[PDB]
Amino acid sequence: QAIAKMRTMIEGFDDISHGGLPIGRSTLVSGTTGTGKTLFSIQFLYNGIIEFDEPGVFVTFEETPQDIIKNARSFGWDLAKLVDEGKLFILDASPDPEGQEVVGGFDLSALIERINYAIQKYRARRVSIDSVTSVFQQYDASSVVRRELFRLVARLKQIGATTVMTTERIEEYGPIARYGVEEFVSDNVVILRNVLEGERRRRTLEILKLRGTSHMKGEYPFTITDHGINIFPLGA
Amino acid sequence: AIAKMRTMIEGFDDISHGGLPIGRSTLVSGTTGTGKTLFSIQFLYNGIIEFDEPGVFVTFEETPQDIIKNARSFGWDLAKLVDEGKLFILDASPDPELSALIERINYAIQKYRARRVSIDSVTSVFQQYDASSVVRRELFRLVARLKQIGATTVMTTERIEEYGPIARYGVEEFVSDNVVILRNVLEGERRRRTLEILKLRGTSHMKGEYPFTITDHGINIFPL
Amino acid sequence: SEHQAIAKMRTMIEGFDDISHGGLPIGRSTLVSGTTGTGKTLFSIQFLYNGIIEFDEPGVFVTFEETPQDIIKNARSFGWDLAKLVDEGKLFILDASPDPELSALIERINYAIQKYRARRVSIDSVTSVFQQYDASSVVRRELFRLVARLKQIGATTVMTTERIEEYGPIARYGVEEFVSDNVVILRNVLEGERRRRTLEILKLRGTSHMKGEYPFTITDHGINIFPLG
Amino acid sequence: QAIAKMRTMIEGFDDISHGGLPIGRSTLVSGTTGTGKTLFSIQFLYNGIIEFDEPGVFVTFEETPQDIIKNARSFGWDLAKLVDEGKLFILDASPDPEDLSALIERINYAIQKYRARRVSIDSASSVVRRELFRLVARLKQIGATTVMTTERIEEYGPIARYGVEEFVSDNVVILRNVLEGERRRRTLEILKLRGTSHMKGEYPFTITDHGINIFP
Amino acid sequence: EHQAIAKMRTMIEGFDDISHGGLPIGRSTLVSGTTGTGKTLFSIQFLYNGIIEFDEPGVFVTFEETPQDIIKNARSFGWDLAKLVDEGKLFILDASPDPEDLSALIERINYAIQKYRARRVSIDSVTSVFQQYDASSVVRRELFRLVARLKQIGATTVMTTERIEEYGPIARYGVEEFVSDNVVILRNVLEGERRRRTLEILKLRGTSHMKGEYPFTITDHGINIFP
Amino acid sequence: QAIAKMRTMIEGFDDISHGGLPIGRSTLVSGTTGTGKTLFSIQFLYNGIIEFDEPGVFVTFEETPQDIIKNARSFGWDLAKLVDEGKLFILDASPDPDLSALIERINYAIQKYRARRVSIDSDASSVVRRELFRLVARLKQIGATTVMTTERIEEYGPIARYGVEEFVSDNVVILRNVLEGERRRRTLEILKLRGTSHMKGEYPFTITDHGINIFP
Numbered sequence A: 001q002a003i004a005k006m007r008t009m010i011e012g013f014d015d016i017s018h019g020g021l022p023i024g025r026s027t028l029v030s031g032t033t034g035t036g037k038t039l040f041s042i043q044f045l046y047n048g049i050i051e052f053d054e055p056g057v058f059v060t061f062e063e064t065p066q067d068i069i070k071n072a073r074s075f076g077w078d079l080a081k082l083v084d085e086g087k088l089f090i091l092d093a094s095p096d097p098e099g100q101e102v103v104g105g106f107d108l109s110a111l112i113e114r115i116n117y118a119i120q121k122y123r124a125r126r127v128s129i130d131s132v133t134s135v136f137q138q139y140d141a142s143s144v145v146r147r148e149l150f151r152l153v154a155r156l157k158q159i160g161a162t163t164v165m166t167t168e169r170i171e172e173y174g175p176i177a178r179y180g181v182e183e184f185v186s187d188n189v190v191i192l193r194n195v196l197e198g199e200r201r202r203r204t205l206e207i208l209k210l211r212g213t214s215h216m217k218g219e220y221p222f223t224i225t226d227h228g229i230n231i232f233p234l235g236a
Numbered sequence B: 001a002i003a004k005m006r007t008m009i010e011g012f013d014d015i016s017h018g019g020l021p022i023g024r025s026t027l028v029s030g031t032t033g034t035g036k037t038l039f040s041i042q043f044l045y046n047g048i049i050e051f052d053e054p055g056v057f058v059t060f061e062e063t064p065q066d067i068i069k070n071a072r073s074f075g076w077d078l079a080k081l082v083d084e085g086k087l088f089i090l091d092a093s094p095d096p097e098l099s100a101l102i103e104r105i106n107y108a109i110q111k112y113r114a115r116r117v118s119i120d121s122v123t124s125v126f127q128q129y130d131a132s133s134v135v136r137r138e139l140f141r142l143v144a145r146l147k148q149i150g151a152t153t154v155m156t157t158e159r160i161e162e163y164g165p166i167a168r169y170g171v172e173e174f175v176s177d178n179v180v181i182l183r184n185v186l187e188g189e190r191r192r193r194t195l196e197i198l199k200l201r202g203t204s205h206m207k208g209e210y211p212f213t214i215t216d217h218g219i220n221i222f223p224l
Numbered sequence C: 001s002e003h004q005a006i007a008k009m010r011t012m013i014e015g016f017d018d019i020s021h022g023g024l025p026i027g028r029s030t031l032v033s034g035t036t037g038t039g040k041t042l043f044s045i046q047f048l049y050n051g052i053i054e055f056d057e058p059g060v061f062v063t064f065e066e067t068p069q070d071i072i073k074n075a076r077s078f079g080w081d082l083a084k085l086v087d088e089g090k091l092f093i094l095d096a097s098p099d100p101e102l103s104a105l106i107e108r109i110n111y112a113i114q115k116y117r118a119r120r121v122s123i124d125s126v127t128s129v130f131q132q133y134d135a136s137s138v139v140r141r142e143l144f145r146l147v148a149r150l151k152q153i154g155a156t157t158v159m160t161t162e163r164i165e166e167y168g169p170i171a172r173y174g175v176e177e178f179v180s181d182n183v184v185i186l187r188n189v190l191e192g193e194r195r196r197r198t199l200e201i202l203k204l205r206g207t208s209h210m211k212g213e214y215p216f217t218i219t220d221h222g223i224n225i226f227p228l229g
Numbered sequence D: 001q002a003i004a005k006m007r008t009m010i011e012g013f014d015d016i017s018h019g020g021l022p023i024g025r026s027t028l029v030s031g032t033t034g035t036g037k038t039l040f041s042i043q044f045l046y047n048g049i050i051e052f053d054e055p056g057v058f059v060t061f062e063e064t065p066q067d068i069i070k071n072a073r074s075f076g077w078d079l080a081k082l083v084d085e086g087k088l089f090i091l092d093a094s095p096d097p098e099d100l101s102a103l104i105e106r107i108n109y110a111i112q113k114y115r116a117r118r119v120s121i122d123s124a125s126s127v128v129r130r131e132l133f134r135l136v137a138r139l140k141q142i143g144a145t146t147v148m149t150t151e152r153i154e155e156y157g158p159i160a161r162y163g164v165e166e167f168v169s170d171n172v173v174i175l176r177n178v179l180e181g182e183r184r185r186r187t188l189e190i191l192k193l194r195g196t197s198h199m200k201g202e203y204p205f206t207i208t209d210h211g212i213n214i215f216p
Numbered sequence E: 001e002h003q004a005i006a007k008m009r010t011m012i013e014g015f016d017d018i019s020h021g022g023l024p025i026g027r028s029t030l031v032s033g034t035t036g037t038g039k040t041l042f043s044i045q046f047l048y049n050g051i052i053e054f055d056e057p058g059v060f061v062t063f064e065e066t067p068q069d070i071i072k073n074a075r076s077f078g079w080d081l082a083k084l085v086d087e088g089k090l091f092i093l094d095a096s097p098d099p100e101d102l103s104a105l106i107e108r109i110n111y112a113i114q115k116y117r118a119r120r121v122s123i124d125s126v127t128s129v130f131q132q133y134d135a136s137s138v139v140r141r142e143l144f145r146l147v148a149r150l151k152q153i154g155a156t157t158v159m160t161t162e163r164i165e166e167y168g169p170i171a172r173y174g175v176e177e178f179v180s181d182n183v184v185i186l187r188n189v190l191e192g193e194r195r196r197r198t199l200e201i202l203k204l205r206g207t208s209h210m211k212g213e214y215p216f217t218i219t220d221h222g223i224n225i226f227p
Numbered sequence F: 001q002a003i004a005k006m007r008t009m010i011e012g013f014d015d016i017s018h019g020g021l022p023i024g025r026s027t028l029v030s031g032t033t034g035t036g037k038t039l040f041s042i043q044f045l046y047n048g049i050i051e052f053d054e055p056g057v058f059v060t061f062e063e064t065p066q067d068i069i070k071n072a073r074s075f076g077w078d079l080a081k082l083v084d085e086g087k088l089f090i091l092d093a094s095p096d097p098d099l100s101a102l103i104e105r106i107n108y109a110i111q112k113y114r115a116r117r118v119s120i121d122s123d124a125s126s127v128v129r130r131e132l133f134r135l136v137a138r139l140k141q142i143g144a145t146t147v148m149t150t151e152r153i154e155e156y157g158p159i160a161r162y163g164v165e166e167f168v169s170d171n172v173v174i175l176r177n178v179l180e181g182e183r184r185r186r187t188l189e190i191l192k193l194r195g196t197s198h199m200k201g202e203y204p205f206t207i208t209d210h211g212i213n214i215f216p
């Protein structure tokens, strides 16, 4: 009765992970700016819908929904259509253009409930939470958001949602995650890197850990192309 | 594909696969004397001269007098463009002796019908001690308004190591759509300038570092 | 070996009893420190599991991170049925994990140890209760009250701790090596895009032991260590 | 109308800077201890007086005027003679062996009094940035061409002390004294000259009986 | 008298050669090193050899470990410390943390030295006493008060303390500022995946010594160096 | 009339400093523990007395006078005799088991003993910089030639501990004890001498029964 996995259908990832992401748990995807974390979290939901008719909920802390949609057009992923069809729900949690300092955790209490009803309403099995770093920066990484983040993770587990959460790190080789996000999103960790090779950049993906199950180890090269992420498990 | 505006900075539109996405902001970050101000001036100058797209330059530390003077190093006559109403330099530099400023920047953009905006040294208004939440929200307020207005913006930021964080306060990469890094790396005893587009949302682009020079004609980048 | 001063119990974790020259010192505590995903929880589960299966020695597992349910689910990765051992009274999993929405815990632990007549104890991620900037004196005294009680009871204890870098301090709070009798380090070193797992016994009070790093794997049978020499 | 420059006449520097220091602006000269900062700032003034009859003001915060004068004897320069002729003024802003608005109009008074064209100023990051910003602006309005020295503690670390001084400076020169394999090597770099060209990278120099000698 | 400082033999094989005669008499020597380098072993061997070889009584002040554990672990080297305690030649002074006023502590150390007529003293884990008071400079020059007082009685003292890196600062918390006369560094260096133990005498005020690192092993007879 | 020097009579040191230590000024001697700083400062005073009959004052903050005397017996030097003769004074400022008060004690000793040589053995950087500058300023005003030691943590790292001590000193000497391949190598470097020339980089030295011997 060891943990089962959900296929991401992201080229090469299901091989590295030996079958996909552990079902009903959160996986942290951490990486410097521009490593492809958001793209990964979108491809996860998009493939869920197209391949499996599994609805997805995308919670956005950094980008607006309109920009999420616009930026995916270059891959030929018609997110607007999936939203119109009710297969994808983009929950806008991104900063107020007229944002001010507010007190409490009522806003993140209401967020978790908003996320829960979205999941219920759209019958979603897949969830992406994009840019945990950003909501941490909204509350100066106070123990208030740390607690709420933990509450969010537990609720998702309680719901049975399979979740990707993305988060920033500052160096290619250094800590797993800025603000130690892996403490709360702790079951599974994937690290994306964008490493200088001479003057060129080489992207790699690593599954550092998946609790309760097996996976390939170390870094595997990938590219981002017109079809999104392509990872090469046998790549040079 | 998303619509891009040509910078006409030699080499840059090839590296960005057509120029800067219209209606969005781009961070240009670098150590001192890497060519950030020059990039942001050239962006406006070319827009006016080649495409008749008016420009607003917001300066937070250099005075407009020095901006105009330093631009004559490249044979650019910015005073003439200001006299013609094609360029507006907005002085936000401090007296030797931000919400409000945002409305003034809005006003200038509509008044001059500007499509291009450059913001130089905006983080000099903050202080080392400020909470990241405050710095981020105050910067975001400005950038969100520019996006709402339709402007395409270059915003310069500072860094203190050539390989190290993107910018000084650790929030700047979250407020802009795109990220460009200018470097000035020591190789033995020689300096080499490079430009890298680190992040360009919604499009492919050339990756890694590309050498450039600053000459009498401004920035020239060599992608091959 | 016969001629060493400290009595030891066998972990039965393949290769560890060779590296430690007989197993873990009885009645004492052993720190197992490592970056995240090095095998700390697996080591501390395997210790209890083997004690029950091989020697019928009951065990108490104190969890600060994972829920008991997840401990049990994850252990199925290795074909271990922990729920059955809990139902039989041979294993007790003590939940000290964060509630969504230390003296007290010590008494609960002591009660569980006497109730289940446990000889083996694993404390997993105890330093997760502390805050990053809590005083060193505070963290050391808190850990020590726990560990001294366990020694007084006569339990043999594995206590896991976190570290941030593979080559760097023994543990995160810089006091952990002072409350423990023995120190073991698990590493997961990344070099040339490949990871390799190793185990080292850094300090074992009162006896010799093999020195340096030894390779190990995690497979469907748990930890396997390969001691060369 | 691109910025004009003033010749330093420091052997090799006017080649590296394509003509000297930008007129009416301040140039930061930063370096670890004993890199030659005070020497550069004195040669600047000295050559101004001797070669071009341009009066100079030297602002000192730690070294006494007499120590400054004494040390310049090392290079065969008679500063006391120039002070007696009124072609050099050393301004003593040192503390006593038991507020920059004040110091500034002291400098300004001295500039107007001695008809000075060259100034040298020898030796919480938010407040330093703002304070150096204001000092730079005040000298610019007076029309002085200024060398200001600053300290740093590593050869390839921060340019100055707080990581901000280089950003608020129009011009930046870095003096290094790098230790490699038990040997020292002095170099000068013009890192930035806003609004004009200059040679790039480090150039070796020596300090001898004649002052700084740079080899382009 | 009017002579250079004299030394007392440790009888730790190899060490009396490296130190040209032993530890400077009537002064403190800091022995620093990462966890598990052999500091406590050095400090016990020093006292044990004094008792067995010279009939010089010893006092062992313990800040980290319990006396029961110190005695039990010393059996690893064939040393019967309980017998020496029973015979009054060794006193172990317990200052380890309670499982639940340092001026008073110094006075008890003094009293013990006088009661047992000890000529050798070991102070184990200065780092630990620092962690109990959070490196407040109340512990720091209460430490100097201890070093001073030891020097007044003419005790010859080993003080052990922790460091974090093999090639980095001499001692965590800057302990070498107080136990400043003599400094010995024990290292456990990683050579690939193997460990190599070394001992260095960094400094002995007022006298000569060999320089750099010397490898050693820990055996069933304690520390064994070879120059 | 450039700055003159007084001989240390460590023959290698007077060779690389071209004559000795600059007269009437303070020289910072920095190094990790056990590099020979105290020995350098004592040898400076001892040679001054034995070779030139220049009395000396040694100011101690850590070691007791009795220990300074005992330790010097390692080199066959009888400092108790020199104290008894009134050629040397060891001023005890070490703590029991106010910068102005210390300075007046130093001044009083220099007058009492007619001393020409002084050695001084051993939070905010601003405070340190200002106190150290006042100490240095008074000694210079008194006429003393001073060696002042400081500690540092790394062989190749900051010169002293507050990042300011080296900028307040006229002269800087760095002692190193570098560990490489399990062996130690001692070196001495004159980093800076204001107003005068000197050899550059690291020079090997040893400490023997004879004290410091430098071998260019």
Ligand SMILES: Nc1ncnc2c1ncn2[C@@H]1O[C@H](COP(=O)(O)OP(=O)(O)NP(=O)(O)O)[C@@H](O)[C@H]1O
Pocket (backbone or CB within 6 Å): B030, B031, B032, B033, B034, B035, B036, B037, B038, B039, B073, B074, B214, B215, B216, D166, D167, D169, D191, D192, D193, D194, D195, D196, D197, D198
């Ligand atoms: N005509 C020219 N020819 C060559 N290089 C020039 C010319 N004019 C200016 N420069 C260079 O351009 C640099 C100034 O670039 P600038 O855009 O001011 O940099 P920055 O990154 O904004 N630096 P700062 O804001 O001062 O930290 C100077 O340091 C010169 O090296």
Ligand SMILES: Nc1ncnc2c1ncn2[C@@H]1O[C@H](COP(=O)(O)OP(=O)(O)NP(=O)(O)O)[C@@H](O)[C@H]1O
Pocket (backbone or CB within 6 Å): D031, D032, D033, D034, D035, D036, D037, D038, D039, D040, D074, D075, D207, D208, D209, F166, F167, F168, F169, F191, F192, F193, F194, F195, F196, F197, F198
């Ligand atoms: N006649 C000379 N020949 C050679 N070198 C000399 C001569 N006179 C002085 N020097 C050198 O000049 C250096 C002093 O330069 P100086 O301009 O005082 O440096 P600085 O960078 O201002 N140091 P500081 O202000 O104390 O941090 C000395 O350390 C000597 O190495």
Ligand SMILES: Nc1ncnc2c1ncn2[C@@H]1O[C@H](COP(=O)(O)OP(=O)(O)O)[C@@H](O)[C@H]1O
Pocket (backbone or CB within 6 Å): A031, A032, A033, A034, A035, A036, A037, A038, A039, A040, A074, A075, A224, A225, A226, B198, B199, B200, B201, B202, B203, B204, B205
């Ligand atoms: N059509 C495309 N082809 C290739 N690369 C693309 C395309 N669209 C976007 N990208 C790349 O994706 C990057 C942004 O990925 P994203 O997932 O937003 O990064 P982050 O890790 O910062 O979340 C851009 O910097 C660009 O390099």
Ligand SMILES: Nc1ncnc2c1ncn2[C@@H]1O[C@H](COP(=O)(O)OP(=O)(O)O)[C@@H](O)[C@H]1O
Pocket (backbone or CB within 6 Å): A208, A209, A210, A211, A212, A213, A214, A215, C034, C035, C036, C037, C038, C039, C040, C041, C042, C043, C077, C078, C218, C219, C220, C221
């Ligand atoms: N059946 C299996 N085969 C191989 N590896 C496994 C298996 N089950 C778990 N693992 C590995 O064990 C690791 C779990 O380690 P864990 O003990 O939870 O680490 P820690 O407690 O140090 O964070 C996983 O990250 C995974 O790599």
Ligand SMILES: Nc1ncnc2c1ncn2[C@@H]1O[C@H](COP(=O)(O)OP(=O)(O)O)[C@@H](O)[C@H]1O
Pocket (backbone or CB within 6 Å): C202, C203, C204, C205, C206, C207, C208, C209, E033, E034, E035, E036, E037, E038, E039, E040, E041, E042, E076, E077, E218, E219, E220
């Ligand atoms: N009989 C023995 N043979 C070899 N090594 C031993 C023996 N007994 C103990 N040890 C070693 O002694 C080390 C502990 O020494 P200790 O002096 O307590 O270290 P420290 O005080 O520096 O942490 C143990 O980690 C083990 O390596």
Ligand SMILES: Nc1ncnc2c1ncn2[C@@H]1O[C@H](COP(=O)(O)OP(=O)(O)O)[C@@H](O)[C@H]1O
Pocket (backbone or CB within 6 Å): E202, E203, E204, E205, E206, E207, E208, E209, F031, F032, F033, F034, F035, F036, F037, F038, F039, F040, F074, F075, F207, F208, F209, F210
């Ligand atoms: N007779 C001697 N022969 C060789 N070396 C000696 C002699 N006497 C003392 N030393 C050395 O001098 C060093 C003491 O130097 P010292 O000036 O006290 O160092 P610091 O003040 O830099 O800590 C001792 O560590 C020892 O190596």
Ligand SMILES: [Cl-]
Pocket (backbone or CB within 6 Å): A203, A222, A223, A224, A225
């Ligand atoms: Cl790619």
Ligand SMILES: [Cl-]
Pocket (backbone or CB within 6 Å): B193, B212, B213, B214, B215
């Ligand atoms: Cl260039």
Ligand SMILES: [Cl-]
Pocket (backbone or CB within 6 Å): C197, C216, C217, C218, C219
């Ligand atoms: Cl493995």
Ligand SMILES: [Cl-]
Pocket (backbone or CB within 6 Å): D186, D205, D206, D207, D208
């Ligand atoms: Cl030179």
Ligand SMILES: [Cl-]
Pocket (backbone or CB within 6 Å): E197, E216, E217, E218, E219
């Ligand atoms: Cl050994």
Ligand SMILES: [Cl-]
Pocket (backbone or CB within 6 Å): F186, F205, F206, F207, F208
């Ligand atoms: Cl030597």
Ligand SMILES: [Mg+2]
Pocket (backbone or CB within 6 Å): A037, A038, A039, A062, A131, A166
């Ligand atoms: Mg993203």
Ligand SMILES: [Mg+2]
Pocket (backbone or CB within 6 Å): B036, B037, B038
């Ligand atoms: Mg600029």
Ligand SMILES: [Mg+2]
Pocket (backbone or CB within 6 Å): C040, C041, C042, C065, C124
């Ligand atoms: Mg674990």
Ligand SMILES: [Mg+2]
Pocket (backbone or CB within 6 Å): D037, D038, D039, D122
């Ligand atoms: Mg100077």
